[PDB]
């Protein structure tokens, strides 16, 4: 698949900095970029630039506010949370985070989250200015199939 769901999800930004000083700039004069300078990085190049060197080039700093000031909020009540305005996806960004990181700490704690969100979703499936709908919209695709199954299954079962 050409992956139209997440090719934009790697289009999002990500703040990290350098370890060396490189004259390769495309961001606009002053072609030497000084080291340890915090730069907004798109996920695609930044994923492999933290790999290619021994010592890689980009200082991968963790955006630990996407670690510590939300691990607490999801370790309390997984019912109505801001899962969305902090990150327009919470799923593949968590996937491609853990591939470089490989730490089972938060890899346990979102595994608690999903079944709890799923526990709402099935038994929410039988049949307002800016922020609110997309709480109800990141869940949409995941169940847009599901209640459309229940919709026809009544319409055969009755007359």
**Using CB under 8 A as the criterion, which residues of the chain lie in contact with another protein when the complex forms?**
2-4, 7-8, 11, 22-24, 26-27, 42, 44-45, 48-49, 52, 57, 72-73, 75-77, 79-81, 91, 94-95, 98-99, 102, 104, 107, 110-111, 114-115, 118-119, 121-124, 126-129, 142-143, 145-146, 149-150, 152-153, 156-159
- What is the number of H-type helices and E-type strands within the chain? 6, 3
Tell me the closest approach of the beta carbon of residue 68 to another protein, in angstroms.
10
Could you identify the residue written with the tokens 């922020």? 131
Sheet holding 58-59, edge to edge: 39-40, 15-18, 58-59
The residues after which the chain has a C–N gap greater than 2.5 Å are: 27, 53, 127
Quick one: 63 or 154, whose CB is closer to another protein?
154
Nearer to another protein, 23 or 30 (CB): 23
């Amino acid at each position: 698949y050409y992956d139209i769901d997440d090719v934009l999800a790697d289009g999002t930004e990500f703040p990290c900095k350098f370890q060396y000083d490189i004259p390769g700039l495309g961001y606009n004069p002053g072609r030497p970029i000084t080291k340890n300078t915090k730069l907004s990085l798109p996920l695609w190049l930044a994923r492999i630039l933290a790999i290619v060197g021994p010592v890689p080039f980009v200082e991968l700093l963790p955006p630990d506010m996407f670690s510590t000031k939300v691990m607490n909020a999801i370790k309390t009540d997984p019912v109505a949370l801001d899962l969305h305005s902090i990150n327009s996806h919470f799923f593949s960004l968590a996937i491609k985070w853990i591939m470089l990181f490989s730490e089972k700490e938060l890899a346990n704690v979102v595994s608690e989250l999903l079944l709890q969100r799923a526990q709402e979703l099935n038994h929410h499936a039988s049949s307002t200015s800016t922020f609110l709908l997309k709480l109800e919209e990141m869940e949409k695709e995941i169940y847009k199939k599901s209640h459309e199954s229940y919709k026809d299954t009544k319409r055969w079962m009755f007359k």
